[PDB]
């Protein structure tokens, strides 16, 4: 309803994103939407628009995580370098917790993911885990085991540190220090 040409912009980005990238959108907006959206992910953005929570800046952030600087130029005419300085302020439409996990996974390469699994075996004890699963999948995997919680990570920093990824560890610290969001019912 409300027609608006904003629907067209939303539709176009869905087609451009790969099935792998499309998963990230659900993950990032997972907190915002309890998967209330029908099976089609196209409707995911549609329901967000209705809530009025869909900001263009958010779309820029969403496209950036999936490493789609190319689409930024075509859809929002946003410079790739502009995103780097813009995100410097580290603004988040939704809790940084969900974005933090997606962003970190993006930084890690395929080899890094495999190495991370071995570290997880010691704590996980060899649970339902495989190299096939992506970094994003690993994040939700830990949720079942309740080894990682929004207000308590600890384990995440240790494993990443082993991979000699100080930058990732630093980003996590920002999140922990960003717990004073003063958000409550």
């Amino acid at each position: 309803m409300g027609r608006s040409d904003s629907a067209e912009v939303i539709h176009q980005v869905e087609e451009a994103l790969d099935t792998d990238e499309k998963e990230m959108l659900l993950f990032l907006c997972r907190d915002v939407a309890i998967d209330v959206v029908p099976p089609n992910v196209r409707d995911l953005l549609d329901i967000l628009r209705e809530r009025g929570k869909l900001s263009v800046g958010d779309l820029a952030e969403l496209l950036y995580r999936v490493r789609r600087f190319d689409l930024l130029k075509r859809i929002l005419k946003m410079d790739r370098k502009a995103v780097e300085t813009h995100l410097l302020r580290n603004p988040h439409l939704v809790s940084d917790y969900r974005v933090l996990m997606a962003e970190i996974g993006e930084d890690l390469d395929k080899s890094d993911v495999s190495s991370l699994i071995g570290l997880m075996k010691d704590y996980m004890g060899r649970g339902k885990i495989s190299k096939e699963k992506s970094f994003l999948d690993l994040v939700v995997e830990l949720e079942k085991l309740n080894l990682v919680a929004p207000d308590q990570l600890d384990l995440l920093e240790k494993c990443l540190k082993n991979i000699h990824r100080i930058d990732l560890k630093t980003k996590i610290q920002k999140y922990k220090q960003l717990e004073h969001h003063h958000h409550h019912h």
């Binding site: 263009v56 859809i75 005419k77 946003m78 813009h86």
Partner: peptide
């Protein structure tokens, strides 16, 4: 940004 986001 925010100035390069308004693009919609």
């Amino acid at each position: 940004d925010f100035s390069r986001n308004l693009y919609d």
